[model samples]
Target: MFKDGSLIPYLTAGDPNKQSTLNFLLALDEYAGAIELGIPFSDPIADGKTIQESHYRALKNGFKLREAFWIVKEFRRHSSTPIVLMTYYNPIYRAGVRNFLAEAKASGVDGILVVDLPVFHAKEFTEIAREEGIKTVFLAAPNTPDERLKVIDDMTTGFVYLVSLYGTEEIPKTAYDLLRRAKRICRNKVAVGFGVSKREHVVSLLKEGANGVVVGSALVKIIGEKGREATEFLKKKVEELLGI
Candidate 1:
C-alpha cells in the first residue's frame, strides 16, 4: 500500500454498522495506499480508549462478523484498494480458520493481521493463511528479541508491522534512533504503526528506513470528530502525507 511517504489509513469494520462502514471505506479508498479494516471484538488488547469506545458503540449498534463480511463483499464490486483485516485471534479461531479464510478471501481481502498471534504462535495461523493464498502479516514490538525478530521475518509473508513503542495505541514521537535500529535488523519491508498520525511522523519513519506508516487511532478519532466529513479530511491528509 506504500510507495514513498505514504500514510495508510485504517478504520474499524462495522464501526457504526455496515451501511456507514461501507460509506466510510469507499470514501477513504480514494486517499489511502491501503485500508486496514479492524474487525471489532469484545476484547481488543492492542487498541486504545478511542478505538475501544468505537468498538463498543458498534457492537451496541449491532455490528458483527456477518455485517463486516457483507461490507467487504459489497465493496469488492467497485474498489480494488488493498484491503486488510485486523482482528483478535480468539474471534478468528472461534469462527474457525478455514471458514474465516474462505469467507475473507471470497470477500476480496488481501491480507490478515491477528494482534495476539505474534511470531511465537504464528506458525499455525501463517500456514493456514498461506494455504488459502492470503498474506499473513506479523507485528514486531520495540522490545522484541533478535531470535524472535528472525522468526518474525521467517513467518511474515507481506512485511513486518513494527510497533514503535510498547503500548495499546499510537502517539506522535520523534524516536528516530529506535526506529532506525529496528529497520536495520530486518531486511524486508518494515512499516511502523504506533503513534504515527501526522505528516512529520510519516517523514521521520520514512527516513528511519520504514517503507510505510500505519495510523489507526488517529483516523478513528478523525472519523468520530468529522463524521461524514472524515473522508474529506482523510483524503486531504493522506495526499498531504504522501505528497500526492
Candidate 2:
C-alpha cells in the first residue's frame, strides 16, 4: 500500500460487530492505501458527530479494547496494510504503557495515534514503542502554536496527523490554509483528517501538498445508512475520485 503517497481509510474497530469489521478490512485490500483501526472509547473529543454516534453504537454493540485487539489480531492473519491504531491516551495509560506496547507489537500494528497525548508527556510511549519497533504518530491540531509544531515535527516518527478542523467531526473550509501551513512546517509525510468527506476536499488537500487524507465520518455515515452496500459504494466512489 505504501507505493509512495497514499490515502488512508479510517474504520472503527468492531463497529457493526467484529465479523463485519474484519470483513471490511479484508475487502479494503484492493481499495485502501492504508487502513486505520479506530479503537472505540467512551469519550472521543476529537471525532465529529457521526463518529461520536458510531462510538456509542459500537459500545452498545459490546465493542471494547479486548474486542478491538481480537479484530487486530485477526486482521494480521489476513493482510499487512500498514495498520495504525487510533485511540486516546487514557486507555493506554490505564492498561500500563509497557504492556500495551508489547501487545500492540504482538498484534502487528505499525503505528499508534494517541490523540490527547502531548509531546512532552509522550517520551515514555515513544521510548517503549521504539524499543518494540512501533511508530508513534502525534496529532497536530489547527490551534497548535508555531513553537509546538517545531517540537512535534522533530518528535513524530512515521508522519504527523494534522487535524484540519476544530471540534468534533465538522469540516470547515478554513482548514485549507492551516493544512498548507502545517505541511510547510514538516519535512515528513503530513496527512489531514477531520471534515474531509468528499472528493472535492481530497482534491483540495492534494493541491495543498498533503501526502494523504484520513477519512472516517463520511465512510461511517455511509455504512450506517446502507450497511454492506456502503462498502461497495465507497470502493466505486474512491476509484472514480482517484481516476483509477
Candidate 3:
C-alpha cells in the first residue's frame, strides 16, 4: 500500500463499543494504507497517556481480544483495505498462539504487531503467523544498534515500526537519521509512529524516506472526546493527512 507513502491510523477496537468502531474503520479504509487496530489490554507498557486512557475506556465497555476478530470479519465483508492488529503478548498468550492465528486468519487479518514481543523471543510466534499467511511486524527505535536493526529487518514481514518519540509534539531530526539508516539495512517497508499527530509530521516523515506513518493517539483522542462524532472527525483527519 506504500506505492506512495502511506497513512496508517490506529484505533482501539470496540472503543465506545463495536458499532462506532466499525463505522470509523469503514471511513478510514478510503484513505488508509492499512488500519492498525488495537485490542485493549490491561497494561500497555509502550503506550503513552492517550493510548493508555483509550485502553481503559475500551475495557470499561467490555472489549475483549476475541471481539477484535468479529470486528475484522465485519470490516472485511465490505472493504479490502489491509487490517493489522497492534496488541500486547498477554492476550495472544492467554488465547494460545494456535487459536489466535486460526481466528485471525479466519477474520482476514493481514498482519500483527505485538508490542512486548522482541525479535529475540518472537521466533515461534513469527513462524506460526507465517504459517497462517499473516505478516509479522516488528518495532525499531533510535537506540537500536545496526546489527540488531538488521536482525529486526530480517524477522519483520509486514513492515518496520519505528518509534520516533514518546509524547513530544515535534518530529526530531534524529528520527529522520534513524529512518535513513533503517532503510539502508532493511528491504521491508518502514513506517514511523509515536507522537505523529499532524499533517506536517506525516509530510516530513515521508520526505525523510519513511514508507508509511502511523497515527495513534491523535486519532484515539478524537474518539475519546467526540463520542458519536468521532467517525466524521476521523474522516476529516484522514483526508487532511492523506491529502498531504
Candidate 4:
C-alpha cells in the first residue's frame, strides 16, 4: 500500500452521509493504493478549513465513530486495498483503546493515524495496538529533527506521515531535503501529506523521494461541494492523481 509514487486519498468518514463515504471509498480504491478515513471529531485541530468543515458536517449529521466499523466491514467485503483510520485520541480514550482497536481489527482496518497523539506519549497505546494486530502511523513535520524523525520511524509499524508544511494548504514548495533525509534514515516507507492537492505536487514529492503522497483537503472539498454526487468527481480526481 506504501508503493513509491502511490496516491493515498484521505476522506472524512460519514461526511455528506455514511453511505456516500462508503461509495467514495469503494470508488477511490480502484486508483488509490490505500485510503485514510478520518473519524469526525468535534474539534479537529490538525485540519484546515475544508477538512474541518467535513468533520463538522459529519458530526452535525450525528455520525458516531463506532459506525465506521460497519462501513469498514462492508468495504472489506468488496476490496482488498488497505485502510488507515485517521482520528484523534479523545474519541479513542472515550471508547477505550483496547475496545476500539479490537473492533477496528475485526472490521479489517489495516492501520491508524492518531493525528493529535504524540509519539513520546504513545508507548502504551502502541503496545496495545501491536497486541491487537493494528498498525500505527505517526506524523513527522518539516521542522522535526533528524533524530526525532528516526524515533518516529522506529515507533511507526505502518509508515511515517511527513507533512510538507505546517497546514493543509496548497504545496508552496517541495521539502526535498527533508524527503531525502527521511528516505535515507527512516526504515519504513515515508509518505508525504499536508497541502498536497495538485497532480504536480504528487509527482514532485515522489520524484523527490516520497514513498507515497496523501491528498486530503482536495478530496474532502469535493464532497463538501458536490455532496452525494461526489463519488463520480472523486473517481475522476483519483484517476487524475495516480499513475497506477
Candidate with top TM-score is: 3
In order of appearance, the predictions have TM-scores of 0.87, 0.91, 0.94, 0.93
The Cα RMSD in angstroms, rounded to one decimal, for candidate 2 relative to the true structure is 2.4
lDDT of each structure?
Answer: 0.72, 0.75, 0.83, 0.83
User: On lDDT, who's better, 2 or 4?
Assistant: 4
Decreasing TM-score order of the candidates: 3, 4, 2, 1
What's the true lDDT of residue 180 in model 4? 80
Model 4: per-residue Cα lDDT over 130-222, one tens digit each:
999999998877777899898888889999988753553345443666778799899999887766666777777788888888888778888
- Stronger candidate by lDDT (2 vs 3): 3
The residue-by-residue lDDT of candidate 1 on 1-244, one tens digit each, is 3465445677887666677778877877766677778888898667667788778877877877767778888888988877778888887778898789878998898888788874455677788898897787777666777667777777777777777444332333434544665566766676677755556666766776778778777777777777656767766666666666
Q: In terms of TM-score, how similar is model 4 to the real structure?
A: 0.93
lDDT of 3 by residue, 1-244 (tens): 3444878878998888877888888888867888888999998877879888999999999886788888889999998788888899989888888789888989989899898885455999889899988898888777788898898888888888888544566777677677889988988998888567677878888988888888888889899999668988888877777663
Question: What value does the lDDT take at residue 237 in candidate 4?
Answer: 76
Model 3: lDDT equals 0.83
Query: How many residue pairs collide in each prediction?
Result: 2, 2, 0, 0
Which 10 successive residues of model 1 have the least lDDT summed? 166-175
Q: What is the lDDT of residue 221 in candidate 4?
A: 81
lDDT of model 4 at position 96: 93
